[PDB]
């Protein structure tokens, strides 16, 4: 199975823990290594940005499931979720209310509670939640 | 024509862009209840589905989608994602915060453009955009 992942210290350690657990269920498609540097270059890196955008789109279409950590506001994560919905992907969004953030009503409103789910979680149970998600509906 | 639009300086600029957009057609935009609905969390999922449906209907009705993308936002990103899949004409305005490489990368320079701007010229830039490709 193929899994697409998109997403301070708490956020980054949870991204690492989610990706590590997703690797138990199939091949994880995720990449963020150049995003900060491409972004810092602005309009001058538009060419490289178009390449990474095409790559993320091909991975979203290949994916059997899209998983997003939606705690921190992000235009990139929101965009990839919009494209994933139009591709009718199975999607799981994970949001941590204890971060102080308010999750966008648009993201909570896009979830139907079946094909697209949004789950609130506490940092300590994210592995157990992913095991629950994939046992109740295996890939 | 129908146009869809998605701190202190940012709020003034959203108001200036919407005011100028009304010269080119009917402007579809709403955020009156978004903060309150969002703060309610899972308890307001029902109301959230209703506003999600309304925004999708407006994105489909729109002849052009305009977004101010200076501040990171999942909702704005999601609406741009849906707009791209609906193959809408899109203009993103960014004020050099650093803009996501994903949004710059989604632009093709034609049907979806990302324009960097300075606060003082935002009205003249909207005039330019609609004179070069009128609605
Ligand atoms: C072939 C290389 C190694 C590569 C392939 C794909 C990607 C990258 C590099 S990247 O430049 O590191 N970034 C992404 N995707 C992004 C996802 C989200 C955001 C955001 O939230 O703003 C930004 C970028 N894909
Ligand atoms: C007039 C009725 C009550 C109504 C119709 C449509 C909408 C609303 C109210 S609203 O609750 O004010 N918000 C939205 N759209 C949103 C756009 C962006 C975000 C975000 O960035 O998090 C959230 C919501 N549409």
Tell me which residues of chain B, numbers 16 to 75, contact chain A at a CB-CB cutoff of 8 Å: 33-35, 37-39, 41-42, 44-45, 47-53, 55, 69, 71-75
Helix axes A126-136, A9-22, angle to 10 degrees: 30
B123-132 burial, b if ≥16 CB within 10 A, otherwise e?
eebbeebbee
Q: How far apart are the first and last CA of chain A?
A: 6
Q: Which residues pair with B27 in a beta bridge?
A: B3
- Measured over the CA atoms of residue A100, residue A110, residue A73 and residue B62, the dihedral's sign is negative
Q: What is the DSSP string of A49-73?
A: HHHHHHHHHHHHHH-SEEEEE-SS-
For the CA atoms of B58, B73, A134, A121, the dihedral, rounded to the nearest 10 degrees, stands at -120
Q: How far apart are CA B50 and CA B102, in angstroms?
A: 28
CA distance B17 to chain A (A): 19
B106: nearest Cα among A35, A76, A39, A6 = A76
Q: How far apart are CA A38 and CA B96, in angstroms?
A: 15
Q: Does B79 sit within 8 Å of A75, measured CB to CB?
A: no
Resolution in A: 1.5
Distances (CA, A) of A91 to A56, A109, A116, B17: 15, 13, 5, 34
Q: How far is the CA of B106 from the centre of ligand 1 (A)?
A: 12
- The DSSP symbol for A24 reads T
Q: How far apart are CA B82 and CA B77, in angstroms?
A: 9
Q: How far is the CA of A14 from the centre of ligand 1 (A)?
A: 18
Helix axes A46-62, A75-86, angle to 10 degrees: 40
Distances (CA, A) of B85 to A49, A79, A84, A91: 19, 10, 10, 17
CA distance B80 to chain A (A): 6
Cβ atoms of residues B90 and B65 within 8 Å: yes
User: Domains, chain A, ranges and CATH?
Assistant: 2-134 (3.40.50.450)
β strands within chain B, DSSP E = 2-5, 26-28, 64-68, 90-94, 112-116
A127: nearest Cα among A22, A2, A11 = A22
B77: nearest Cα among A98, A80, A118 = A80
Instruction: Label each residue of A81-102 as H, E or C.
Output: HHHHHHCCCCEEEEECHHHCCC
Q: How far apart are the first and last CA of chain B?
A: 6
A16-33 burial, b if ≥16 CB within 10 A, otherwise e?
eebbebbeebeebbbeee
Q: How far apart are CA A89 and CA A1, in angstroms?
A: 14
Q: Does the Cβ of B102 fall within 6 Å of ligand 1?
A: yes
What stretch of H or E contains A27? strand A27-29
A52, A85, A107 ranked by CB distance to B74: nearest: A107
Q: Report CA A100 to chain centroid distance, whole Å.
A: 19
Q: How far is the CA of A1 from the centre of ligand 2 (A)?
A: 36
Residue B77: other Cβ atoms inside 10 A = 31
B95 vs A: CB within 8 A: no
Tokens describing residue A92? 């799981």
Burial class (CB in 10 A: 0-12, 13-18, 19+), B40: middle
Ligand 2 pocket: which of B11, B31, B68, B75 to mutate (most atoms <8 Å of CB)? B31
Residue with tokens 């449906």: B53
Please tell me whether A7 is known to bind a ligand: yes
Residue A1: other Cβ atoms inside 10 A = 13
Distances (CA, A) of A4 to A10, B9, B103, B106: 21, 36, 18, 18
Residue with tokens 């494209």: A83
B44, B45, B101 ranked by CB distance to A52: nearest: B101
Cβ atoms of residues A66 and A89 within 8 Å: yes
């Amino acid at each position: 199975p193929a899994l697409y992942f998109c997403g301070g210290r708490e956020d980054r350690t949870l991204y690492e823990r989610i990706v590590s657990r997703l690797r138990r269920f199939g091949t994880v498609l995720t990449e963020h290594v150049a995003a900060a540097e491409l972004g810092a270059r602005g309009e001058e890196a538009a060419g490289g940005d178009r390449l990474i955008h095409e790559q993320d789109l091909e991975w979203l279409q290949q994916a059997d499931v899209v998983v997003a950590e939606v705690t921190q506001p992000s235009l990139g994560v929101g965009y990839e979720l919009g494209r994933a919905v139009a591709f009718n992907k199975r999607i799981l969004c994970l949001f941590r209310p204890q971060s102080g953030r308010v999750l966008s009503a648009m993201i909570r409103g896009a979830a139907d509670g079946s094909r697209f789910q949004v789950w609130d979680y506490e940092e300590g149970e994210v592995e157990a939640l992913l095991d629950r998600y994939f046992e109740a509906d295996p890939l």
